[PDB]
Design a protein around this ligand. Structure first.
Ligand SMILES: *CCC(=O)Nc1ccc(N2CCN(Cc3ccc(-c4nc5cc[nH]c(=O)c5cc4-c4ccccc4)cc3)CC2)cc1
Length: 379
């Protein structure tokens, strides 16, 4: 089959970090990609699953605004919600029908008592994340509990991604049990050490690049939430990117790519931005931007630029400068090569990437834990 546009038109998308409604031109192709653009798209990339309407339920409501239709999608272990608004009810119905057609057209023992519930890691609209301990193994896991109302496919394993081990559902809930690293939060390590050495950051940076490459080329998904808070270390001291994300309703926007703040089309380059912010904090001991006013913090990320400390090396300068480019098309890793643009960078000279993936590179830091069951970083 050939990928063509099923329906295109102007919609009013609710901003994901801005309560306001925003005029965006959306394209609905038969591959399932529902992407919206600030202006009518240039007639001139690879398919990302972030925008796929596959396995999504459409809900038409009149709140908080009349003629509203909501797409609700289960992506990996996180329910995402995208709210849209049209002017006439007839437009909504031909939009939902079009999307429902493509969505359907793309079809082509374990219980709660087995775990011990120590800490609430996060709460959200469609569920919560809880730090649990399996009674039998004595091991620590993160359980992602989602509302049910809202096949072992574990070839999704990767050394630097929190593994989704299994999935079970209770009466009215769907629970995702996943690995929880006990090497402590990385921000807790960074703040404790104030700043990472340039080579140490290289290590953490390399392992993230490996994982991002994996998500982009194999899984064709964008992580989109690459921040310091979402990075942990395992007992060995290697990076684990978490998957504890939840939708919430009603500083925080610092880790956000400019195109994401402007609710434009975003792609893989967003993760490289995220990567830039993280590696900036590791080598500088400070976020790129800080100011309190959300309108000023937004404009900081949108138009103001990033100063570099003279303590920083020139190779790190070129890397952060490229990673933290305002325009995703000019951004390092933003072209077709993706992660290859970043892996070939001089900051990562002498770093062989097959070895990073096989954890051959010796960690520059070893967490103070005898075992995975060591609760030294939880207390
Ligand atoms: C409140 C409204 C709303 O929609 N809120 C909201 C905003 C943002 C998000 N997310 C969703 C999760 N995303 C992080 C993320 C991205 C990708 C994965 C992931 N995906 C796949 C897909 C297919 N196969 C895989 O093996 C995958 C693995 C992973 C993955 C990535 C890293 C670690 C573990 C697993 C997971 C999380 C952030 C923004 C949601 C709701």
């Amino acid at each position: 089959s050939d990928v063509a546009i099923v329906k295109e038109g102007w919609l009013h998308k609710r901003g994901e970090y801005i309560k306001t409604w925003r005029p965006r031109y959306f394209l609905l192709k038969n591959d399932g990609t529902f992407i919206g653009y600030k202006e009518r798209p240039q007639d001139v990339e690879a398919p990302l699953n972030n925008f796929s309407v596959a396995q999504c339920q459409l809900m038409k409501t009149e709140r908080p605004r009349p003629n509203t239709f909501i797409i609700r999608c289960l992506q990996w272990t996180t329910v995402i919600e995208r709210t849209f608004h049209v002017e006439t009810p007839e437009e909504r119905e031909e939009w939902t029908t079009a999307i429902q057609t493509v969505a359907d057209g793309l079809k082509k023992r374990v219980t709660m008592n087995e775990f011990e519930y120590l800490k609430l890691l996060g709460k959200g609209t469609f569920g919560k994340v809880i730090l649990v301990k399996e009674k039998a193994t004595g091991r620590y896991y993160a359980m992602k509990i989602l509302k049910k109302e809202v096949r072992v496919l574990q070839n999704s394993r990767h050394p630097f991604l929190t593994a989704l081990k299994y999935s079970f559902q209770t009466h009215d809930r769907l629970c995702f049990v996943m690995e929880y690293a006990n090497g402590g939060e990385l921000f807790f390590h960074l703040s404790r050490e104030r700043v990472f050495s340039e080579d140490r950051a290289r290590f953490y940076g390399a392992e993230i690049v490996s994982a991002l490459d994996y998500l982009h080329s194999e899984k064709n998904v964008v992580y989109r939430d690459l921040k310091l808070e979402n990075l942990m270390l395992d007992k060995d001291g290697h990076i684990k990117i978490t998957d504890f994300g939840l939708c919430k309703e009603g500083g925080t926007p610092e880790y956000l790519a400019p195109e994401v703040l402007e609710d434009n089309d975003y792609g893989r380059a967003v993760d490289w931005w995220g990567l830039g912010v993280v590696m900036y904090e590791m080598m500088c001991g400070r976020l790129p931007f800080y100011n309190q006013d959300h309108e000023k913090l937004f404009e900081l990320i949108l138009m103001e630029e990033i100063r570099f400390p003279r303590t920083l090396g020139p190779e790190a300068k070129s890397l952060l400068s490229g990673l933290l480019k305002k325009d995703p098309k000019q951004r390092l890793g933003g072209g077709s090569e993706d992660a290859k643009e970043i892996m070939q960078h001089r900051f990562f000279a002498g770093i062989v990437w097959q070895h990073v993936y096989e954890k051959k590179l010796s960690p520059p830091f070893k967490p103070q834990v005898t075992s995975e069951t060591d609760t030294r970083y939880f207390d």
